[PDB]
Amino acid sequence: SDVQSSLTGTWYNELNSKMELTANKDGTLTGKYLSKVGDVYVPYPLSGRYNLQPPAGQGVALGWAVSWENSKIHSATTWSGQFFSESSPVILTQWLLSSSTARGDVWESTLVGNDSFTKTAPT
Amino acid sequence: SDVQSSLTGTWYNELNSKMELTANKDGTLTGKYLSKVGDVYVPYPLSGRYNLQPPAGQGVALGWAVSWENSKIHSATTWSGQFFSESSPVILTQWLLSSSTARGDVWESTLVGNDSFTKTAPT
Amino acid sequence: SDVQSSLTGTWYNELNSKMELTANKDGTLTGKYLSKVGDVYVPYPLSGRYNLQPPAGQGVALGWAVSWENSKIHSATTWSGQFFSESSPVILTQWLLSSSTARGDVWESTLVGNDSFTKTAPT
Amino acid sequence: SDVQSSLTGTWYNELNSKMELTANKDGTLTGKYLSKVGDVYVPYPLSGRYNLQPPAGQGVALGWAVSWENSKIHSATTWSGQFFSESSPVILTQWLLSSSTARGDVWESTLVGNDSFTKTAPT
Numbered sequence: 371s372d373v374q375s376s377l378t379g380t381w382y383n384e385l386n387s388k389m390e391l392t393a394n395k396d397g398t399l400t401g402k403y404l405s406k407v408g409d410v411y412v413p414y415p416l417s418g419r420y421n422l423q424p425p426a427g428q429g430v431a432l433g434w435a436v437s438w439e440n441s442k443i444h445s446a447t448t449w450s451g452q453f454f455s456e457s458s459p460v461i462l463t464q465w466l467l468s469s470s471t472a473r474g475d476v477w478e479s480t481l482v483g484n485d486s487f488t489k490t491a492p493t
Numbered sequence: 494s495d496v497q498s499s500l501t502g503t504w505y506n507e508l509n510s511k512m513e514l515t516a517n518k519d520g521t522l523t524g525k526y527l528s529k530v531g532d533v534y535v536p537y538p539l540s541g542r543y544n545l546q547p548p549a550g551q552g553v554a555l556g557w558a559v560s561w562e563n564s565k566i567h568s569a570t571t572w573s574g575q576f577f578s579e580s581s582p583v584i585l586t587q588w589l590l591s592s593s594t595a596r597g598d599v600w601e602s603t604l605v606g607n608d609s610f611t612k613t614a615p616t
Numbered sequence: 617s618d619v620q621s622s623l624t625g626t627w628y629n630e631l632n633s634k635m636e637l638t639a640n641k642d643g644t645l646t647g648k649y650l651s652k653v654g655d656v657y658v659p660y661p662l663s664g665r666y667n668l669q670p671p672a673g674q675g676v677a678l679g680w681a682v683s684w685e686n687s688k689i690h691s692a693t694t695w696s697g698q699f700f701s702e703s704s705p706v707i708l709t710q711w712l713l714s715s716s717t718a719r720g721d722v723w724e725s726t727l728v729g730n731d732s733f734t735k736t737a738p739t
Numbered sequence: 740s741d742v743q744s745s746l747t748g749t750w751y752n753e754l755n756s757k758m759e760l761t762a763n764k765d766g767t768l769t770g771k772y773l774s775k776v777g778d779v780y781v782p783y784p785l786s787g788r789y790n791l792q793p794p795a796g797q798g799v800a801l802g803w804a805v806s807w808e809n810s811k812i813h814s815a816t817t818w819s820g821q822f823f824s825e826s827s828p829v830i831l832t833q834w835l836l837s838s839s840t841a842r843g844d845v846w847e848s849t850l851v852g853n854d855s856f857t858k859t860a861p862t
């Protein structure tokens with residue numbers, strides 16, 4: 371099956387955040403992201419891109435972006451990583467969360483972390 | 494002016510890569526990215542998101558993704574950072590470049606770097 | 617706190633790498649690191665620094681460096697993160713692995729990842 | 740190579756931070772780091788490691804760590820990158836700044852950035 375058949379759907383990370391992901395035939399990603407951490411309370415939309423043609427036995431490289439804006443927050447996260455559809459499906463990512471700052475404070479504006487997404491919510 | 498008025502257009506980074514960026518009213522980013530490094534030879538499409546409503550005197554947080562696939566490459570980069578439209582416009586970013594690997598080799602699959610984009614190509 | 621009483625010792629990460637860590641009273645880290653991945657085959661020494669006085673209910677921030685040199689490898693990794701002693705001890709880190717390159721190739725010189733260290737080797 | 744003959748000394752980054760670096764024959768780095776940003780006001784000691792034998796035309800990979808502790812700060816930074824001595828000397832780095840947090844807040848504990856060090860203070 372094509373990548374979208376395995377990639378489109380709901381994914382959950384270790385923080386119990388929920389991503390409703392759609393992988394389109396043109397290689398784009400769309401959908402909604404609900405973070406269980408940070409001062410956000412509803413899903414925010416995502417946009418990204420993903421590999422259509424992974425070499426056999428290798429991951430689908432992919433990445434996506436979310437802009438977060440509410441009364442208190444003006445930031446954007448990107449996730450970059452690989453989706454593996456075989457055996458135990460997973461999206462293994464690292465992410466960069468850049469927050470709006472004064473130009474002089476750019477040095478302290480970007481958080482880095484890692485998220486692992488699976489098809490079942492963590493207990 | 495709204496963010497798109499200042500953000501849409503051609504941007505160049507320190508590597509002399511050229512990004513043709515369009516900032517849409519719905520907060521999405523689209524366009525094309527031509528890297529001057531790596532074994533890629535034509536532009537690749539991008540998708541991302543950006544802040545619509547930056548607090549006064551602060552950056553527009555934003556991020557975008559490119560999937561790179563050709564005969565030799567299966568990878569994806571995301572950039573995360575801030576766009577400043579005042580005085581000397583700049584997009585200051587950090588990026589994560591994830592390459593397709595076997596699942597056991599995920600540890601060595603993600604490069605990290607930084608790109609600074611301006612409105613004029615470097616000499 | 618007496619951080620060294622909990623921090624000094626052998627630690628194992630998810631890749632089954634083994635770190636023999638000593639935390640000194642002056643806030644320095646020394647020891648040996650044996651990676652189970654990459655083209656390295658013997659332990660390499662480490663040097664780092666760690667917080668001596670963690671706030672109650674919070675992690676000990678710490679970081680260390682390893683220089684790797686053999687016939688084919690010239691690189692260095694740093695790990696940055698937090699050590700939690702109070703329950704299920706762990707060192708949660710992100711790391712940066714910089715490899716020797718030509719100056720023009722710096723953009724592709726740094727890998728990023730994450731390692732979780734515990735007191736028992738993974739099965 | 741005799742790396743220490745070029746590496747030991749005072750270095751300045753883009754933020755006008757000043758690092759007094761000593762590179763020892765055993766491959767260790769020691770010295771003092773004075774940051775011009777963040778709520779720190781005195782130098783803090785560093786510990787690290789560096790490549791002793793760079794391949795011709797390539798950088799010396801290196802990394803170091805600083806633990807920062809004062810009345811309000813408990814954090815640690817590591818820098819990872821490359822030192823180039825042969826022309827216009829520079830240390831090109833990326834860094835990870837981990838701050839003490841509750842275990843549940845680890846996701847927001849690590850900043851990432853980049854520092855370029857040269858032998859002359861920025862204007």
Ligand SMILES: O=C(O)CCCC[C@@H]1SC[C@@H]2NC(=O)N[C@@H]21
Nearest residue numbers: 387405407408409438443445447
């Ligand atoms: O606090 C913000 O600026 C907005 C919410 C950010 C939540 C981040 S995104 C990376 C990490 N993974 C998640 O599922 N949530 C956090």
Ligand SMILES: O=C(O)CCCC[C@@H]1SC[C@@H]2NC(=O)N[C@@H]21
Nearest residue numbers: 510528530531532561566568570
């Ligand atoms: O080599 C690849 O896997 C595809 C090309 C990657 C080029 C990267 S993306 C980050 C950095 N910034 C650029 O303008 N080019 C490189």
Ligand SMILES: O=C(O)CCCC[C@@H]1SC[C@@H]2NC(=O)N[C@@H]21
Nearest residue numbers: 633651653654655656684691693
């Ligand atoms: O390949 C090299 O350049 C030297 C070995 C690097 C091994 C890395 S360090 C980060 C990660 N964690 C480990 O325990 N091993 C790898």
Ligand SMILES: O=C(O)CCCC[C@@H]1SC[C@@H]2NC(=O)N[C@@H]21
Nearest residue numbers: 756774776777778779807814816
């Ligand atoms: O705020 C802290 O937690 C301690 C000071 C951190 C200063 C950082 S380290 C990375 C960057 N480079 C510098 O020269 N200063 C900042």
Ligand SMILES: [Mg+2]
Nearest residue numbers: 410411412440
């Ligand atoms: Mg909200």
Ligand SMILES: [Mg+2]
Nearest residue numbers: 533534535563
């Ligand atoms: Mg091509």
Ligand SMILES: [Mg+2]
Nearest residue numbers: 656657658686
């Ligand atoms: Mg070896």
Ligand SMILES: [Mg+2]
Nearest residue numbers: 384486630732
């Ligand atoms: Mg895990």
Ligand SMILES: [Mg+2]
Nearest residue numbers: 779780781809
């Ligand atoms: Mg101080």
Ligand SMILES: [Mg+2]
Nearest residue numbers: 507609753855
């Ligand atoms: Mg610069």
